[PDB]
Design a protein around this ligand. Structure first.
Ligand SMILES: Cc1cc2nc3c(=O)[nH]c(=O)nc-3n(C[C@H](O)[C@H](O)[C@H](O)COP(=O)(O)O)c2cc1C
Ligand SMILES: Cc1cc2nc3c(=O)[nH]c(=O)nc-3n(C[C@H](O)[C@H](O)[C@H](O)COP(=O)(O)O)c2cc1C
Ligand SMILES: Nc1ncnc2c1ncn2[C@@H]1O[C@H](COP(=O)(O)OP(=O)(O)OP(=O)(O)O)[C@@H](O)[C@H]1O
Ligand SMILES: Nc1ncnc2c1ncn2[C@@H]1O[C@H](COP(=O)(O)OP(=O)(O)OP(=O)(O)O)[C@@H](O)[C@H]1O
Lengths: 364, 364
């Protein structure tokens, strides 16, 4: 049964864009007997140089890879195997090789051959590792930031009552100054100790607040394209699921800003999450990000959605700490974002959009 | 130039474990002219049924995939393309097809053919999506848990001073009870207001504490294998990098426990991070996880490393809130872990290991 002529197959294999090799078993060596030009391009070795010897030279000295042992076991067993490992071109460049090997037995000559299809997954590996770094740093930064915001909010809430207590103690001392009652000394002493405890309370606040503020707010030259893509990999994963239409109408002339990177990443991740959640129950789901020039040699970024939008009595409350409309929401994202923008030398505000959604703007 | 006979190539292609097809361009249709048995197995269609018609029937009614348009554009242009999309077997099963297509022009008959190598990436896609779900839920749970622990720690720190203030106010009122000084009423009133403010402070504590405790501590029947693997995907990624040797010496007879899943995931993620960090600067890096039967129809889990270990004056401080030895550490992991184990009906403790590392045990 021949569906196509073997010449045609050979032609397709030769011109395929994936590296395709065929090897022959000779004891512990699986010598190459065919390589297609895609393999030559991927590896940089010429076919005249590497025929009739095992492919393991692509590993170099990097033999500390479990995939190698997996492949050796698969060859010994006789089963196929797909594995991804680090290989090196003739010039020394490192690349990630996803190779599928199928051992097949030729009964014409009773030999064991293998067909190997190999492709470059280096870009996928790099993006995935970058995403892992981002997820780890984002978890650490989110824990620290939430704790710090909690501490600051408590301090602000408790400043009035402790101050009032101190002032009452001061006033009571002043009233008792001119007293002849025998109990007055003890009373005074009692009040004194009370005052001490009040001050101690304040101290405790700072003693933990500064404990969690152990992170310095750096600012460096940063590419907006880069930090938008870094934030997007975490926050904008899953656009296909909610059928959200993404549009980045970006200006190549307004790309470089002065910013930190972990803080802008966390601001954008939070904005992206809030926008995706607000458009989760929307009919038309479209998110637009745009940059424009602004005053004071700044650049303004606008993010507009078709989400749940802002009710009339909502917009001036958005940035107040603990304000949320969600059952499980905390209401910390925008407060942290506003503190980050103000620390970096910009302004942030919100408005309703003409589609019933929300438009956020900030400057840097 | 023929390195191998075309019959041999055909044989290798036929027996390859990856689906390999060859198609021919006829206007808007790329009709299949060859399919290898791997493709038949992957799709479930017989070659006699599907030859000489376009592959798009594998999509079914799921045409809302951008990869389809990408491939159509690539075919129009004439370039290769690798894309992953959802396809469906003849029985209706869904699978993830990674297909690489290379268009090649045959000048023998001046036609355009395509060679397509297609493999199943369904398992990889599922594991990656599960990891995305885990990272999202872990971020949310970590923010909430950190905030709650912060609030509880503040409350515990501030209980003494506020109580002391209240007691001083009470004592002062008792001393002033028997007084004739004209200023005594005002003094009393002042103290009264002071007392109010003290109580208000306490109220504020609860008003935020219960605000962040908006999460119910569920407990369900859970597989230890499953929750260890779920926690490992996040926390144990990167074993190859630090050359850490993982050993799960597990008991199939002691696999089912009564536990929550998000909370045990977060406990294990934290333990895995602490163990990886402690072995980061170690010479021999080996992590062992083991389960054994314990009293009261419980099961005890042991996790041992060769890490930095415990100094003599360290072990009884490990679980106290804010205790850490790291420059950027917060010291919240073990306190939360102990509260989780105690809520689920178990005990948790630590000891030094014979290799200079740390051994942690818990019961459920
Ligand atoms: C057809 C075929 C292609 C192979 N291609 C590669 C390759 O591209 N890169 C690589 O590092 N190993 C490749 N290998 C694996 C090595 O040839 C070798 O089998 C592997 O290192 C395990 O054997 P070893 O432990 O003796 O090295 C290939 C093997 C076969 C059969
Ligand atoms: C060689 C080859 C193999 C293909 N294999 C598949 C496949 O396995 N599954 C699939 O959904 N589409 C596959 N396609 C793509 C479809 O044939 C079709 O070209 C694609 O849907 C874009 O064209 P359309 O928009 O007219 O459908 C393959 C295309 C070629 C050339
Ligand atoms: N694009 C938007 N459209 C409509 N409402 C919005 C939008 N963005 C924010 N909001 C509302 O304003 C609030 C601002 O608070 P924030 O976004 O920080 O809260 P959250 O994301 O619920 O909290 P957290 O991130 O701390 O769990 C949101 O909780 C939500 O109620
Ligand atoms: N396996 C271990 N070997 C040696 N020291 C350890 C080990 N596990 C924990 N420790 C020490 O005990 C402390 C227990 O606190 P915890 O692990 O919660 O802190 P952390 O991970 O630094 O803090 P956080 O997770 O809140 O940032 C650690 O900070 C560390 O100093």
């Amino acid at each position: 049964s021949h569906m196509i002529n073997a010449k045609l197959l050979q032609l397709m294999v030769e011109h395929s864009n994936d590296g395709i090799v065929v090897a022959e078993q000779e004891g512990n060596e699986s010598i190459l007997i065919y390589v297609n030009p895609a393999f030559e391009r991927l590896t940089g070795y010429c076919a005249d140089d590497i025929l009739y010897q095992d492919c393991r030279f692509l590993q170099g000295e990097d033999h500390d890879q479990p995939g190698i042992a997996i492949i050796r076991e698969a060859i010994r067993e006789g089963r196929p195997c797909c594995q991804v490992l680090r290989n090196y071109r003739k010039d020394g460049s490192l690349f990630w090789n996803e190779l599928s090997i199928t051992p097949v037995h030729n009964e014409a000559d009773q030999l064991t051959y293998y067909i190997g299809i190999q492709r470059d997954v280096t870009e996928h590996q790099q993006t995935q590792a970058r995403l892992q770094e981002l997820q780890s740093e984002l978890v650490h930064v989110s824990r620290l930031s939430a704790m710090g915001e909690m501490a600051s909010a408590l301090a602000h809430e408790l400043n009035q009552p402790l101050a009032a207590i101190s002032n009452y103690m001061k006033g009571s001392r002043r009233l008792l100054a001119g007293s002849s009652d025998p109990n007055t000394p003890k009373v005074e002493s009692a009040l004194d100790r009370a005052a001490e405890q009040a001050l101690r309370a304040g101290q405790i606040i700072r003693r933990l607040r500064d404990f969690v503020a152990r992170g310095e707010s750096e600012k460096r030259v940063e590419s907006l394209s880069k930090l938008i893509e870094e934030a997007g990999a975490l926050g904008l994963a899953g656009a296909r699921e909610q059928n959200v239409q993404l549009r980045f109408s970006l200006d190549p002339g307004a790309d470089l800003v002065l910013a930190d990177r972990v803080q802008i990443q966390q601001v954008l991740v939070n904005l992206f999450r809030n926008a995706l959640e607000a458009m989760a129950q929307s009919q038309r789901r479209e998110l637009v990000v745009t940059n424009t020039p602004a005053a004071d040699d700044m650049i303004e970024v606008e993010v507009s959605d078709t989400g749940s939008g802002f009710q009339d009595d909502v917009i001036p409350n958005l940035f107040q700490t603990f304000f949320t409309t969600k059952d499980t929401g905390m209401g910390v994202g925008l407060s942290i974002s506003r503190s980050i923008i103000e620390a970096h030398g910009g302004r942030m505000w919100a408005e309703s959009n003409a589609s019933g959604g929300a438009t956020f703007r900030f400057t840097l």
